[PDB]
From Swiss-Prot, chain C:
Compartments it resides in: Synapse; Postsynaptic density; Cell projection, Dendritic spine; Cell projection, Dendrite
Family to which the UniProt record says this protein belongs: Belongs to the protein kinase superfamily. CAMK Ser/Thr protein kinase family. CaMK subfamily.
Protein name: Calcium/calmodulin-dependent protein kinase type II subunit alpha
Assembly behavior: There are 4 genes encoding calcium/calmodulin-dependent protein kinase type II chains: CAMK2A, CAMK2B, CAMK2G and CAMK2D. The corresponding proteins assemble into homo- or heteromultimeric holoenzymes composed of 12 subunits with two hexameric rings stacked one on top of the other. Interacts with BAALC. Interacts with MPDZ. Interacts with SYN1. Interacts with CAMK2N2. Interacts with SYNGAP1. Interacts with SYNPO2. Interacts with SHANK3. Interacts with GRIN2B. Interacts with CACNB2. Interacts with LRRC7. Interacts with GRM5.
Gene expressing this chain: Camk2a
Protein function: Calcium/calmodulin-dependent protein kinase that functions autonomously after Ca(2+)/calmodulin-binding and autophosphorylation, and is involved in various processes, such as synaptic plasticity, neurotransmitter release and long-term potentiation. Member of the NMDAR signaling complex in excitatory synapses, it regulates NMDAR-dependent potentiation of the AMPAR and therefore excitatory synaptic transmission. Regulates dendritic spine development. Also regulates the migration of developing neurons. Phosphorylates the transcription factor FOXO3 to activate its transcriptional activity.
Composition-biased stretches (Basic and acidic residues): 3-12
Post-translational changes noted in the entry: Palmitoylated. Probably palmitoylated by ZDHHC3 and ZDHHC7.
Modified positions (Phosphoserine) in chain numbering: 11-12, 14
Disordered: region residues: 1-22
Domain of life: Eukaryota
Modified residues (Phosphothreonine): 17-18
Length: 459, 51, 51
């Protein structure tokens, strides 16, 4: 059904690759999940992932087009978005301000609101899920990958499992409390914070200490970098990074926050180069750290790659191996002799009165000096046509070429000079003979020798 | 030479046949002096050589 | 070091395929140059330059 092309990204248990639907001629992203490496439970919950992704129809969410299982693999086929990560794109930009971060977060919150309205909680919102629609200027930010997403029943909270990414985990998930939609607003607070200053609000080498920080809500706004951030951006972060999920801002309420809805009078327009610089390092530290979880029930070293091949000529070119050797023309002929060949064909064409073959061997702008031109230079083949039509269209005539000399001037140019003697009969012969000295200037154009100029004397 | 006057000079070469050709060729040098009279070019004088 | 500005240029016997660069380089005039030098060499009776 589909044809797989380049890889676009990875997880521990999936890769994503561009693909083309064979019968459609439409391109898509294929999420290819190695089901042999999943738990029974995570394999089964692919049904839930497939279902959630079909439900979701929104301009800022990538949608599912198809789901296929084979013996060792499951395929979830989505829209292709080609802009890559928002976060990578931010660091390549010429200008980046609070007003620009507000537009990013608004798009994310719109997507999240739509999830929440459909009874979907993402649970694992992080920079990797934030993709750009295309490489065009001002492309939309799009949510991609809902592999840890859950379905909830109205506003009911439950214990859906300990799942997420350490830095973005909500306090309630870490306290083992029943949870729901607000987990995604905590993660948006963490993302917003990183969008403003380029580093996360909670970080520790020791994961247990990290979790105590999260549960305590122990983040800060240190000088110098937060000194130029507006109070309203800080207010929105505070409202999202509220420890008690019942008191945390919702996605609907966040979208009405002045830093978002009154962006044009509230959000700063100042370029934040330090954010761009910190975000580069953040982005780089994210790409060294493997997608691997803290631990699992297995003992296999990571392996596997995709090799190309190189295009090669078909058939049996030669017995011994030929690794791109400098091949030359095969043993066909000698170049002087080649000139002799086309020249003999020329003389035969003139003798037979065949203007058709004479035209092919002559350049359309052929130059000519001959006694029939009375000392003038003639261009073209119109002049010799009068002799092809009248005279040569026919008593016995024998030509004889004497003392031919050939000058080879590169692969594409040559010149031959010789003496032509013609034996003929005039009226009631009386056999006669005439001498002429002829020069032909040949030039190979598109693999064919053509006369560019010729000179004749005493005829 | 203005809107109403012009002059062209060229070499005329004629290929023909005499009696039982035997293709022949002849050269002449020709000058034509054109003049527009009432919106129409007309020859007022011409000169030929070697014909 | 030995970083001379006008470095010397020597090819082996190379193949010379046609080269249609978009810019209009001059060459016809070059032929006209060497030809005029030829005619002047013949006129002056300078067999040295003619050789």
């Amino acid at each position: 059904m589909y044809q797989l092309f380049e890889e676009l990204g990875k997880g521990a248990f999936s890769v994503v690759r561009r693909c083309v639907k064979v019968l459609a001629g439409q391109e898509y992203a294929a999420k290819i999940i190695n089901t042999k490496k999943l738990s029974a439970r995570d394999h089964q919950k692919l049904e839930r992932e497939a279902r959630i992704c079909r439900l979701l129809k929104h301009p800022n969410i990538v949608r599912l087009h198809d789901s296929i299982s084979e013996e060792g693999h499951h395929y979830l086929i989505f829209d292709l978005v080609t802009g890559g990560e928002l976060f990578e794109d931010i660091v390549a930009r010429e200008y980046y301000s609070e007003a620009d971060a507000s537009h990013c977060i608004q798009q994310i919150l719109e997507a999240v609101l739509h999830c929440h309205q459909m009874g979907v909680v993402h649970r694992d919102l992080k920079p990797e899920n934030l993709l750009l629609a295309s490489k065009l200027k001002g492309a939309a930010v799009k949510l991609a990958d809902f592999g840890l997403a859950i379905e909830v029943e109205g506003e009911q909270q439950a214990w859906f499992g300990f799942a997420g990414t350490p830095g973005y985990l909500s306090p309630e998930v870490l306290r083992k409390d029943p949870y729901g939609k607000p987990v995604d607003l905590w993660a948006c607070g963490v993302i917003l914070y990183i969008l403003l200053v380029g580093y996360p609000p909670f970080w520790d080498e020791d994961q247990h200490r990290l979790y105590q920080q999260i549960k305590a809500g122990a983040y800060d706004f240190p000088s110098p970098e937060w000194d130029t951030v507006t109070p309203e951006a800080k207010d929105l972060i505070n409202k999202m990074l509220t420890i008690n999920p019942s008191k945390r801002i919702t996605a609907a309420e966040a979208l009405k926050h002045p830093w978002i809805s009154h962006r044009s009078t509230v959000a700063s327009c100042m370029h934040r180069q330090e954010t761009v610089d910190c975000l580069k390092k953040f982005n780089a530290r994210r790409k060294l750290k493997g997608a691997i979880l803290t631990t699992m029930l297995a003992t296999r070293n990571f392996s596997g790659g995709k090799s190309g091949g190189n295009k090669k000529s078909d058939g049996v070119k030669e017995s011994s191996e030929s690794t791109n050797t400098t091949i030359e023309d095969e043993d066909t002929k000698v170049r002087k002799q080649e000139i002799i060949k086309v020249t003999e064909q020329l003389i035969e064409a003139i003798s037979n009165g065949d203007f058709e073959s004479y035209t092919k061997m002559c350049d359309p702008g052929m130059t000519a000096f001959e006694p029939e031109a009375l000392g003038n230079l003639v261009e073209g083949l119109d002049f010799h046509r009068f002799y092809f039509e009248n005279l040569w269209s026919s008593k016995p005539v024998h030509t004889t070429i004497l003392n031919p000399h050939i000058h080879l001037m590169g692969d594409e140019s040559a010149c031959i000079a010789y003496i032509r003697i013609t034996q003929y009969l005039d009226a009631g012969g009386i056999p006669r003979t005439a001498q002429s000295e002829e020069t032909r200037v040949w030039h190979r154009r598109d693999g064919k020798w053509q006369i560019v100029h010729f000179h004749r004397s005493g005829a």
